[PDB]
Structure formats: structure tokens, C-alpha cells
Design an enzyme around this catalytic site. Structure first.
Site, PDB file in Angstrom:
ATOM      1  N   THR A  25     -11.882 -51.909  10.980  1.00  0.00           N
ATOM      2  CA  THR A  25     -12.422 -50.641  10.507  1.00  0.00           C
ATOM      3  C   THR A  25     -11.298 -49.660  10.196  1.00  0.00           C
ATOM      4  O   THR A  25     -10.448 -49.393  11.043  1.00  0.00           O
ATOM      5  CB  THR A  25     -13.376 -50.012  11.542  1.00  0.00           C
ATOM      6  OG1 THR A  25     -14.584 -50.780  11.610  1.00  0.00           O
ATOM      7  CG2 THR A  25     -13.715 -48.579  11.157  1.00  0.00           C
ATOM      8  N   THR A  26     -11.292 -49.130   8.975  1.00  0.00           N
ATOM      9  CA  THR A  26     -10.287 -48.156   8.569  1.00  0.00           C
ATOM     10  C   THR A  26     -10.894 -47.212   7.543  1.00  0.00           C
ATOM     11  O   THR A  26     -11.494 -47.661   6.563  1.00  0.00           O
ATOM     12  CB  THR A  26      -9.045 -48.843   7.990  1.00  0.00           C
ATOM     13  OG1 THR A  26      -8.515 -49.766   8.949  1.00  0.00           O
ATOM     14  CG2 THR A  26      -7.976 -47.815   7.649  1.00  0.00           C
ATOM     15  N   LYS A  85     -19.662 -46.836   6.136  1.00  0.00           N
ATOM     16  CA  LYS A  85     -19.115 -45.982   7.183  1.00  0.00           C
ATOM     17  C   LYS A  85     -18.788 -44.575   6.698  1.00  0.00           C
ATOM     18  O   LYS A  85     -18.269 -43.769   7.479  1.00  0.00           O
ATOM     19  CB  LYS A  85     -17.866 -46.628   7.791  1.00  0.00           C
ATOM     20  CG  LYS A  85     -18.089 -48.043   8.297  1.00  0.00           C
ATOM     21  CD  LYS A  85     -16.787 -48.823   8.363  1.00  0.00           C
ATOM     22  CE  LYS A  85     -17.049 -50.317   8.467  1.00  0.00           C
ATOM     23  NZ  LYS A  85     -16.010 -51.013   9.274  1.00  0.00           N
TER      24      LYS A  85
END
Lengths: 215, 222, 215, 215, 215, 215, 222, 222, 222
Positions: free
Chosen positions: H1-2, H33
Site C-alpha cells: 500500500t502506497t 484507497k
């Protein structure tokens, strides 16, 4: 002097219920038939409480709406507590009578409502439908044939006691109901039936083309 | 314990096994793990046997209570939210050994396209939910083998019969690779239970078709 | 003798509502149109409750302000509880009716307010707008065409029942509204519309140059 | 019979407020000017609520002292909750109106007070000052030019409606205020100003040599 | 009809306070001088609240005894909360006014007491003494020169307004006080002084040989 | 109209106390002497509160019994809190006055009791005995010589003000007490003395042969 | 930290050091640990520096509050009881690391003999108290050395000057034997603080006499 | 996740990856996200997938509720304070394994200079917040690689297109260096999602431009 | 993190560094740690970055609230008591890892001597406070080096300029000896922030003078 206070409260309740529309419930071969004068399409005076129990009332909407919500809550809690087959209309009628009796005395303004509870047999069984009547002060009575509430009731009762034939059909019973109430097309009418030939849930509404054809 | 679900053009299908065990000892042989929640949804919960029966009962009671109170059934998003809240409220019990893993499949009557109204929703331990876009999902202790089988068998799905056959084959593979999953019982006559949801509603699948499909698969693999 | 007490409370509420400005709400092709006589630029008699529900009232500001706040709180809590699409104007109208009915009896002074709730269809859908009326005692009624509240209402109702044409335009409906209220420029007027062609939120205010051009 | 009770309470409040000194608040080029007849040097009838909000009242000291304390508490809590720039005079006026309305009905003795809330623009901005009036029963009104409260108000209002020139100076506005109140040297006078050219806090008192030179 | 109730309560309080002894407090060069008619050697009508604040009252003993105890508790708590130099007589006077105002309305019987609060400058500082008066209904007033309470007050006030010379001495001020009260030897007299030349605590009683020599 | 209510309550209390026996307490060289008309040998109207404090009352037994129990509880708690030498009769008298004042107003029926508190010097010390009187409404007074309560008091007071000689003996003081009460043998008499020559506890009862010889 | 107290004919005397440390690092150089509670009592608390300041303030406030409420000052037994209750109410804080060890010295104005009205009271951890009958007492981390010094030096006490000299010498010995106690500072000019209580009241001792006594003691020991 | 965010003249831009994992097993392939909170703000939360969806929903509901109640939108400082309070109220959950790391980007309409109205705010575990003055920020498990890439690539940012290209390149580098971050999927057709905020409001970026930029970057790096 | 404060004839001065770190990684470069509480006081809090911002805000709000309620500003002793209560109420948070070390400097307008009205107050972990009589104090992780530098440099303080120069030099020494303290940044242009309080009030120091002093010190030490 509680005599004057009780007389005044009873007069208030009677005057409140007198100026209202009439609801008629009768039992036919297929169960119970509910017919009411409801021009509004969004506010309903006939509903269901459980799989085999129906609800009907006449009076002020904000009162029997709360009564219906309380009855549904009680029925759901009792059904989940023990079983679905252990819920009977007598248990709901007793609760309604106790609630109305408590409201009449303690609360400053009594409730101007009239309640009726109807039940039918389960699937694959034979039993006579049961009808109960609950008044504002909490009196509970048993009616074998029909219940009339709302507005004037004597002429309607006399008209119904004449053409009421036991073990009739849906169309014929609807005709007697409409004739008794008139003494009305698709509009200004609410019709519901407790069908005893359904697997689990017996309540259904008839409106539109089906109501037009039946009437 | 393994429950599978997949999408076919015109509806969805669900199926599960009938084995319950206490460690290494077999204690159940005809356990039912797939339930009909309402006219267009089905729920399958994996994990502890006691928790699933209570979970399905509470979910059905809540949905019926809301329907009776408001007079209008809930939307799909509302049902998903209620199920997610129910799952999230059991974190302490899951940490104490009472864990439940539900799986949801339903048909959306408000969807614009009637041929793509089938939905499969999966849940995680923390309470999150996701809508599957690949067409199949599985839960339980043998879900990996079943998912791997469907990954290769999904190209043959055309209608309800093909989906049911693929589901039965996936359950057979999961039972073959996992000792906690019960396979078909030819000596006793116990077969997996299935539910099909379409535009008309959710209907239970009769045992005869499942038995025929299981016999055909066994004959083919022999 | 609850008769005298209820008569006195009803007289108090009627006298309080009688000496107030008038609010008119009517439905046009694009939704619902709210027009009120509000000289003050900081106090508003028309507002929004949710994405498709509007609020309007006439009377004492500190009362329907609290009513609006309670309605917004209820709508937000219900929307977060289940979903945004599960919020309907009937649920808010019932809550308002129950609150007003409870206030009327128990509380020493009744509320001199009149409430109206309006709802429109969602995006990409066709449905007739719904209007509800709630009185001080808690009575709830359904109005298909228009609602008039505040001050005298008979002459305004008779004027509106004449030039009201179904499926009109914004400018024409505004002209009928202003003509009915007169029997008023940019000042001393508050105009709001529930636009049913908007993606999510349907409430918007029209003031200044746009109101000047329309009128 | 709530009619008699409300009439009696209103008469009590009116008689209490009638026998009191007068407070005049008006807006000039630099903000708002507060002038009151306060011989006492220790009890103050004019104060501040926040960085841009001022307080003024007439009546019984122990009542509007508590009102001022509650307003300060509310303003501080709201400012710390979200931000210092999210505090507006309307929010304080609404709270005061609700509190007074609740006090009037439930409490045995009503409050014989009159409240006024004034606000000015922030630094480096241009906006017209806002003035609000709150009465004993909770009525809230908007005044664009000036507010007169305490004792008799008709002659003072007629005198102020004559010589009031918009965009005046501090000395000239003080002269009009003193002339209107007379129809008074350093003693028996309290003067405060909301200066809109200050960085953060706009409230300051003028007494002694500066008040002597200005008057 | 709260008019009759408030008139009756005020009459009760006035009649209760009328039949009581008189207390006189005046300011001299050394601070404040308290003189009261107290034949009893065990019950005291003059006391101290803090390092620079004094207490005096007239009426029923069991009421202002509780008032004195509450004032001492408040002063001690406030002094420990922030600092000893942050306690002022105005804060105690406001608390007393609020307490008396709350007692007058809610409680069945009002308090027949009259309160006075006096304060002096700190050591090594020059400031005029401050005197406050609090009545039964909660009214608070500022008196620059002297306070007279208890029994009849007009003749005593007229006598005091004649021979009162600012910046007098202890003996001379005592003579004026005794002469005004007479219009009394060691017995039937209570004398206390707030001395502003003391390091920390300014309250001390003068009785016996010192009182005999001074008088 | 609290005037009528307070007059009626005072009349009730006066009528209740009027029809009761008389209690006389006087101070002699050895302390305080309590004499009461108590035919019953099991119910006592004279008791002790602490090491140097005595209790005496006239009226209804179930009321001053509770008062005595509360006083004993307060004295014991205070003595254990700080020290045994920090308990004084003034502290008990103030508590009794506050309790009676609270009972008189709030409670539906007032207390028809009269209380007296007496204290003596400690061992090896010289101090004059202190006597206090507390009435039904909570009034507290200081009496240097004697206290007379119960029934008629004027003739008894006039008789006692004649033969009372300061610094008398036990036998002589008993003779004066009996003579004043008569205007009575071993029976129908209760005698108690606070002896100031005792080490710690000063209360003792005299009955039987010793009372016969003394009288 | 060390506080000493001793009796002489006609009154009492108290003294303490002026050093505060955080482990092995010096953080304070002019700390005052002896306070005047009322007209005839003095209190010295050892242990944590923060707790002592709050303790003395609360004790003085309580005594003044009682005096104002009742109009008569408390007896010696009442003050001892209040101090014992205050000490006993801090057992949990002491167990958590906030410990206070008070020492009380006062003059009894109600005593029959004016020449034996001086009192010294010591307290323990559990909250008990005892009245010293030997004539001296000490508290702190160097109390043993000071007590041993006074045991030999008490024969020279005749009046206030002798008692003050003995107290200063005991503090000097305690500072010599303990590194947590600060001795006289000739370079900076910081000396211990003292309080003398007699029939007239409690008066602080001026710094000049203490400096002279310290210089004389240092010269004698050189 | 970034999740990455950077400033360009005239607005801001945000982007994130579409991978969710349970340990070393891939469980999600199209996770979103980045959300639009209001007309001028965007929020991206990293950490547990379940917590972020609830956090964004609660934040949006709170902002809309305040706007409806007061009739005027909150200032930027008020929104930052509300977000900081929300983050600080989850310390126990984070210690128990439910941790959320939000990132905020918005456009200030009340700023004097329209060309410098873009704002990026970062939060820490304890609940503190800081306004970035360097022009870029990143959160997640591969934020270090992305930040190092932007440190060298920020000199080429001139308008929205350059900022979007730099963000996509930074996400590509983070996915290259971190196995928990999902890169572009050419076989399936899944690409990162982006949001652009300018003086007109926040608009979602269509997938076509992102796919074109990803293909160009892949061709350049080949 | 290091904050220094010293007294000069006519007022006081405070200064601090601009570095924040998370272990061994630099995360902040322009952090401000010195705030103006009211017209005559300044506060500097060391420790966790999140706690200090909330502490200063609460302290300022409390002081302003009291001033508005009573109409008269608090005395110096009252402010010290409020700060001590605030510090003591955070013992559990400090034990849990949220520790704050404040430092207070102010000007007393009620002091008899206008040339000795500057005050510096330091606090400890338990909540105790002490008024510095030596003229300087420092807090933070590099306070020992700064205090040692001021011990030698305090002889050159004559007015505000000398005090500011000494404070900057002490901060430079602390940054030289401690890796958690950030020194002057000539490449970026970031310098320590300072506040001067005198008889007219507290005024922030412009960056130009601080930059000039830092450049002069760097040139001298080269």
C-alpha cells in the site's frame, strides 16, 4: 372525586373516536378480510404483526402507529425467545389491553383509538379464525363473526347482521363489506386479506387491477 | 467445512459440505450450512457449528423485523452493512475461540441489467467486505483447493446446470485434498446441499440432481 | 376537565400561528418550489434535511430551529446506520408528528409552529413529488399539489387553486407563487428549489441577480 | 388557562425592565459604539465575548452576569473545538434566545433582561457590522443601524432616527449618543468600542482623559 | 399571579428584617470600622472572610452563619486554587448575591438577612476601601462611605451623613458611630476593625480595657 | 400567602408545647442542676451528650429522642475526628438550631419540642457554666442563670427570679428548684447534675436514698 | 536532605540543608525545607521536593480554615492527628515513589510549666507518631550521623544560641558524612536556614548569625 | 500500500495502488484507497483495509453534518483539527492491531494567492500534524522509495500532466522496490486511481490517461 | 530538541531549534517550539512534538478564559500554579510515552525594580517548580552542553543583543554535541527562532538578525 374525572376522560375518548372513519373486519372461507376507508396511499390503517396475526385500527395515526410498532417488537422478541409457533394473537391482545389500560389512568390525555386483532390457522390445519376487540380503557372482548369500529357503528352492524353468510367467497364477502360501508371505487379504499392457504406468511394487500376486477 | 459460490448468466448458486468434526473424530454427517435469508439472498457461514446457526437466525430476524417496521425491504448495501456490523461485533468471541466466517450471495432486482444482477460478497476477520468481480469465491478450511479448481473450471460455465456441476466438482476436489471436508457418501446416501437464486427467487435444489452429478463425476474420475 | 385545558391550548396555538407570515410550497416540473416572506437575510425559514428532503416552517424561530436540528440529526444517524438510499420523507414526517404530539400534551406551553416536508425522486428516475403537513397537535396529512401555512390561508388557497397548472416551468410557477402571496421584489422574499436533475444533492437557493431575472 | 399565566409573566417582565437605565449601541466607521449609564465603577453593563463579539445588556445584574459567563464559556469551548475563525455572533445569539425561552416558561420567575450581540469584520476584510436583539421571551430580531434598550425607548429611538449619519466618526457618533441619551460628563457613563482595525482582539474601554477629550 | 406571591415574600422579608438590631460600617484612615449592638458574648455578628475581606450582617443568626461558612469555604478554595492575592471582595459579593437570589425564588421561605462586604488595600499600597451591600432578593449595590442595615435606617443615615468626616481617626470614628447608633458602654457593643497597616491579616477585635479606653 | 402558613405552624407548635410538663435547669457552685417532672422510670427527659455537655428537653418523646441520638452521633464523630478537648456546647447548639430550622419550614408538621444545652469547665479549671436555649423555629439564645421550658413559664420564672442566690449548694438549689416547680417527693421527679469536680465525665443521676436524703 | 530539631530551656529550634539532587547530579542550591505553619509551630518535610511544598501548603490551609470556621485554634493533639491522617493518606503514593517524611516542632501555650513547653513529634511510614522525650530528633538521608553528633553535643545546650550552634554542627557533620547533603558554601554564600520558636512566637533566624557560626565551626575544625 | 501526493502550480494531485494482501497471499486486486471528502479535499488512508473505509465515511459524514447544521463550510484548520482528533482517538485500536495512517490534500479557496492554494498535510502516530513545505509526501509501506523518487523527479513538474506523470512514476518505483505494492497489470487491465483538485473542484482522473502514462513509462524503462 | 533562556538587564530572551526526528530518521526541518502565551510570557515545551502543541494551546486558552471571566489578568504565581497542575496531571501519559518538559520565561510588571523583572521558571517530572537565580536555564536532550556553554559565556551579556548572541552560540554548541539537535542550515536557509520580552511586551525576532549572528559565529569558529 374520581367519578367526574373518569366520566370526563370517557367522554373525551368517545368524542375523539366518534369523528373518524369506519373499519370493518369479517371472516370468510379463506381467512379474514380487512376493508377500510383510507384515501391516503401513504398512511395505512391495516398491517400485519406476525406470520398469522393481523392488525387494524381506527383513530389518530400517531397513536396506533406506536401501538403497531410495540406489537411488532413484542411479537419478534417472543418468537426469537422460544419459537415461531409459540406466538398467539391472545398474547398480543392482552398486551394491548394492558398498555391501553395503563395509558388511560396515568397519562393526562387518553388514547382515542380502537384496536382489533385477528388470527388464522396454520398451514395444513383447520381452525376457526379468532377476532378480538380492545377499547380505549383496556376492555377486551371476543367476537366470533365480525368487528365494526370507527364513527357510527349501529347502522353498519345492523346492515352486516343481515347479509353475512358463513363460508362465503372473497368476491361475495367484499361485496357485502362495500355495501355495508356504503350504507366507493378503487380510490378511498384499503383492502387486505389473511390467506390461510399460504405456506408461512398470510398477509397480503390487494390493490389496482386485482382490486378493480374483484369489486 | 467448505462453502463455494459462483456466478452464471441469470443468477447465482451456492453449495456446501455436510461434515462436522471435533478434532480428529467425526461427530456429524448431515449438517446443513447453507440457509435462505430472504426471497433473494442466501448466507453460508463457516467455522464453529454453534455460532453459524445463531448468526443466520439473527440475520433473518433482523431483516424481517426491518421489513415489517418500514414496509419496504432493505437495499443490498444496507444488508451488507448490517452483516458487516454483525461480524465486527464478534471480534472478542472470535479471539476467545468462537469464530464465524460468513459468505453472502444474492440477486439484485433493482439492477439495470437483468443478466448481471448476481452478487457475491466476502468478509474478513476485521469486518471488511468486498464485492467479487472474478465470478467465484470460497470459504472454509479447504477453500484454497476449491478456488484453484474453479480457476480452471470456470470456462465451462454457461447456465445453471454448468454452474452447479462446477460447484459440485470444486467441493469434490476440496474434500479430496482436505480431511475435514466430507465427500459424497454412496453407502449412506448423503450429498451436498445447494441453493439457486434467479429472477424468480431462491429455490433449494432437489437431492436427485446432486446425486446424479456426483455419480457422473465419480464415474468420470474413475 | 381536560376539555377546557385542550380547548385553551388549541386556542393559544391558533392565536400564536395566526399572527405570522405565510409560506407557500408547490410542485413544478423540476421538483418543489419554496417561497416565503423573509425580510431578514440571516434567519432562514427554508432549509434542507437530506439529499432529497426539504424543510419549511412558519412560526417562532427558536422552535422550528430546534425541530430542524433534530430532523437533521435523525436523518444523518439513519443514513449512516443503514444506507443513504434508505432515508425517506415519511420517516422524518412521522418523527416530527410524534415529537409535536408529545410536546403538545406534556409541556406547559405548546409550540406555535407549522411544518412541511417535501421529497423528490432520485437521479434517473421518475416519481411524483410528495408533500406532507404537520400541525401543532401532531396531525399529519398528505397534500398532492400545494401546502399553504402561516397567517390567513383561505384567500391564498382560493387564489392558488385557480392558476395552478400542472407541469409548469420555474418562471411561471414563481409568478403564480408571487401573485398568490401578494393577494414583492428581491427584498422580503426567500426562494428555494428542490431540483430533481442534480446528481446527489437537490437543494439550492436562488438570490440576487438570478432571482431578479426570474421575477 | 395559560393565557392569564403568560399575560401575567409578560407584565412582570415588562414592569421589571421598564424601571431601568438605558443602553444605546450604534455602528460607526470603525465598528460598534456602546454607551451606557453606569455610575458604578465596579459593575459593568458592557463586556466582550470573543475576539470580534461584544456583549451589552440592561436589567438585573445577577441575571445578565450569568448570561455573560455562559456565553463566554460557550464561545471558548466552540473556539477550542474547531477553530477561532469558526465563531460567529449568530451562534451566540441563538444560544441566548434558546436559554431565555427555556427560562421564561419552566422557571417560576422570568428574567427581566434585554440582550444585544454585536460583531465586526476580521482584519483586512470589509463587512457591515451585525447587531442582534434578544428579548425576555426569547424573540430574536436583526437591527441594521442601532439598538435601544432599557427604560423608555420611543423618545430615544425618535431622537436617534434623526441625527444618525452613516459612516460617521468616533467623536461625532459619541456626540449623537450622548445627545440622544440626555434627551452627562465623565461620571455616570460607560463607553466601549469594537475597533475593526485591531489585529486580533477588537474590544477596548475608553475612560478618563481620553473619554474627557473625546466628549 | 406571581405579582401577589412576590409582594407577599417581599413583605415577609421586610417585616423580618425590620425587627432587628442595627449594624453600622464606616471607613476611616486605617481601614473599615464595624460596630454592632450584640449583648451576647458568644454569638458574633461581625467576622472575617480572608486576609483583607470582612463580613457583617443583621438578621437571623442561623442564616448568615451558614452564609459566612459558605463564604469562608469559597474564599479558601479559590485562594488555594490560584493564589492568595487573586481573592477580591467583589467575587464574594457576587456569590452572595447569586445565592440570595436563588434562595428568594425557589425556597419556600426567604431569608431575612442583610449582608455587607468590606475590603482594604494590601500592605505597602494605597487604595480606597470598598464596601458592598447585598439585600434579601439578591440586589448588589456599591457604597463609597458607609452602610447602615438592621431595623430603622433613615434617622441613623441622616445622623451619619452630618458628622462623617473623611480621613478621621479611630477614636473619633468610634465616637461618631456610637453617637449615631444611640440616636452604650462596653456591654451591648461589638467592635471590629480592618487594619491596613498589618502584614498579612487585617482583622482584629477590640474588647475590654482597650475598648473602654477608646470609648 | 406564607404569612398565614407560618402563623398556623407557629400556633400548632405553641399549642403542642403548651400542654406539657415543665423542666428547670439552673447553675450552682458545683455545675448545673437538672430537675424534671417524670413519673415514668423508663423514659428519661435528661441525658448527657459528651464528657462536659448535658441534654434536656420537653415535649414529644419520639422527637427529642431522635434529636438526642443525632447530637450524640455528632459529638462522637467530632471528638474522634480531631480530639476530645475540641468539643464545645456551642457547636452542638448550632447544629440543633439548624436542624430545627430546617424541620420547621420543609417538613409538613413542625416539632413541638424545646431544647437546652449546658456545659461546664474542665478539671482543674475555673469557668462559668454556659446555658443555651433552642426553640422550635430554630432561634438560639444565651441564658446566664437559668432556663425554664414546658407548659406555663411566667409564674415559674417569677418564682425563680426571687430566691435564686448565686454560688449556692446542692441541697439549697434543689430546694429552690422543687419550690419553684411546686408553685413532689421521690416519685414524679428526675434529678441530674453536671459535677465539675469529676476527672473526665461530669454527668450522674441521683435517685433513691440519696435523692430522699437531699430533698 | 537532613532536617534537625532540638529542645532548649524556653523553646525549640529547627534547621535544614539547601541541596536537591537528581541521582548523582546537583540540580538545586538554595532549596528551603523549613516552613512556619502557624504562630507556634514549624514543619520540615524530607523526601521528594515536590511533595513537601504541597504538603506544607495543605497543612497550613487546613489549620487556617479550621481556625476561621470555629474561631478558636486547634490543640496540639488535634494538629498531630491531622498531620498523621495526612501522612497515612499518602501510602499508595509513597509506594509509587512519592514519599514524604515530616517532622514537627512546636510550643505549647497551654502547658503548666513555661520552661518545658517545647515539643518534638516524629512520624513513621505507617502513619504512627511519637513524642520525643530525649530532646532531639532528625530526619532525612543523613539523619543517623546528625543524631549521633547530637548524642555527644547535647550536654552543651543551655539557651537558644547553644542550641543553634549544636544544630549547625550536626548539619555540618551530616553533610560531611553524606554526599546528598549540602554543606556551607563559602564561595557562593549559601547557608542553612533556621527557625526559633519561643513564648513570643516563631521567628526566622537572620543569615548573619548562621554564617558567623558556620565560619567559627569551620575555623575550629581546620 | 502506497499513496503519494504532490503540488503543482494551480492545484494538487493524489494517487494510490490497488493491492491488498494477507501476509504473503494476494487477496485483493482492485482496491480503491483514495476518496473525495468534499468539493475541495481528498483523503487517502493507509494500513488496515477495513479501518480506512470506515474512517473516510465517518469523516465525510461529520463534515457534511457540520455544513448542514451551520450553513457554512468549515475552514481548513477546523478540518485538520477534526482529522487529528479522529486519529488520536484510535490509539488503543492501533496498539491492538487496527492502525490507520491518513494523508490529506486540499485546495484553499480563501487563500490570497490562487497559484499557491494547494495544501498537503501529514499525520503521525501520536496524532500530530504538519503542513508540508517541500511539495510532496507519501504514506504506506513503500513510502521511502516513492519519496526518494520524487526528490529527484520534482524538477520536471510544471502543470497537472507533469505532476500526474511524476506520481505514476513514483508509484511504479515503489511497486518495483516493495512486494506489498501492486504495479500496473497489463494482462488484466488494472491501473492506479488518481484525483486532481483545482480551482473548480476535485475530479476523478479517467483510466485512459493513466493507462497511457503507465505504458509510456514501461516502454521507456524497457 | 533544545530550548534555552537567559536574563539580561531589562528583560528576557528565549530560543529553540527546528529539528524533529523519529528515531534516527529526520522527519521535520522547520518545527517551531517557542510560543507567545500572553503579552508578557513565553513558553517552550520539549519532548514529544504532538503533546507540546496541545499543551501551549490549552495553557493560552485557560489564561485568556480566566482574563475574560474575571476582567483582571492572573498574577505570576497563579500562572506558575496552573502550569504546575497541568504538568502534574500528565504523569500517566508520561509513563505511557507522552512526556512534556515545559520552560517558562516572563516579565513581571508589578515588580518594584524594573531592571530585575525577568523571571525564568523550570519544572521537573513530579510537577515541582523552581525560580532560577543564576540567570539561565535549558531543557531538552542537549541541555547539558548548552548549560555548560552559557556557564562560560554569561560574562559577556550586557543587553538584548549580547543575550541573543549567547543564546545562538549555546544552541550551536548543543547542536554540535548532539545529533538530535539541528544546527543552522545555510543551504536551505533555516535558522532558530527567538522571542524577546521587555517592558513593552513580547516580540518575535526577525530572521535577518538571527541569520547574521549565525553567519558571524560560523565564520569565527572556522
Amino acid at each position: 372525586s374520581p367519578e367526574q374525572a373518569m366520566r370526563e376522560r370517557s367522554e373525551l375518548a368517545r368524542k375523539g373516536i366518534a369523528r373518524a372513519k369506519s373499519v370493518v373486519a369479517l371472516a370468510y372461507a379463506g381467512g379474514v378480510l380487512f376493508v377500510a376507508e383510507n384515501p391516503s396511499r401513504s398512511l395505512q390503517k391495516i398491517s400485519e404483526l406476525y406470520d398469522r396475526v393481523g392488525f387494524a385500527a381506527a383513530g389518530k395515526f400517531n397513536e396506533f402507529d406506536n401501538l403497531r410498532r410495540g406489537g411488532i417488537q413484542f411479537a419478534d422478541t417472543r418468537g426469537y425467545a422460544y419459537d415461531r409457533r409459540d406466538v398467539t394473537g391472545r398474547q398480543l391482545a392482552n398486551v394491548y389491553a394492558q398498555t391501553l389500560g395503563t395509558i388511560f389512568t396515568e397519562q393526562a390525555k387518553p388514547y382515542e383509538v380502537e384496536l382489533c386483532v385477528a388470527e388464522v390457522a396454520h398451514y395444513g390445519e383447520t381452525k376457526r379464525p379468532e377476532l378480538y376487540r380492545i377499547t380505549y380503557d383496556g376492555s377486551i372482548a371476543d367476537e366470533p363473526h365480525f368487528v365494526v369500529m370507527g364513527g357510527t357503528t349501529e347502522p353498519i352492524a345492523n346492515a352486516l347482521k343481515e347479509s353475512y353468510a358463513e363460508n362465503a367467497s372473497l368476491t361475495d364477502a367484499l361485496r357485502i363489506a362495500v355495501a355495508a360501508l356504503r350504507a366507493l371505487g378503487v380510490a378511498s379504499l384499503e383492502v387486505a386479506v389473511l390467506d390461510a392457504n399460504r405456506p408461512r406468511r398470510a398477509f397480503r394487500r390487494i390493490t389496482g387491477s386485482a382490486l378493480q376486477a374483484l369489486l | 467445512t467448505t462453502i463455494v459460490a459462483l456466478k452464471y448468466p441469470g443468477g447465482v448458486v451456492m453449495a456446501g459440505d455436510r461434515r462436522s468434526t471435533q478434532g480428529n473424530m467425526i461427530s456429524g454427517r448431515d449438517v446443513r450450512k447453507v440457509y435462505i435469508t430472504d426471497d433473494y439472498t442466501a448466507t453460508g457461514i463457516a467455522g464453529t457449528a454453534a455460532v453459524a446457526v445463531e448468526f443466520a437466525r439473527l440475520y433473518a430476524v433482523e431483516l424481517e423485523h426491518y421489513e415489517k417496521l418500514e414496509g419496504v425491504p432493505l437495499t443490498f448495501a444496507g444488508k451488507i452493512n448490517r452483516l458487516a456490523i454483525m461480524v465486527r461485533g464478534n471480534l472478542a468471541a472470535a479471539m476467545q475461540g468462537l469464530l464465524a466466517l460468513p459468505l453472502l450471495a444474492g440477486y439484485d432486482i433493482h439492477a439495470s441489467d437483468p443478466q448481471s444482477a448476481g452478487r457475491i460478497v466476502s468478509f474478513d476477520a476485521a469486518g471488511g467486505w468486498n464485492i467479487e468481480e472474478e465470478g467465484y469465491q470460497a470459504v472454509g478450511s479447504g477453500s484454497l483447493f476449491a478456488k484453484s479448481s474453479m480457476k480452471k473450471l470456470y470456462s465451462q460455465v454457461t447456465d445453471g446446470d454448468s454452474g452447479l456441476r462446477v460447484a459440485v466438482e470444486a467441493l469434490y476436489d476440496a474434500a479430496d485434498d482436505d480431511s475435514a471436508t466430507g465427500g459424497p457418501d454412496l453407502v449412506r446416501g448423503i450429498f451436498p446441499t445447494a441453493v439457486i437464486i434467479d429472477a424468480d427467487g431462491a429455490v433449494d435444489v432437489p437431492e436427485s440432481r446432486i446425486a446424479e452429478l456426483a455419480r457422473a463425476i465419480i464415474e468420470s474420475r474413475s
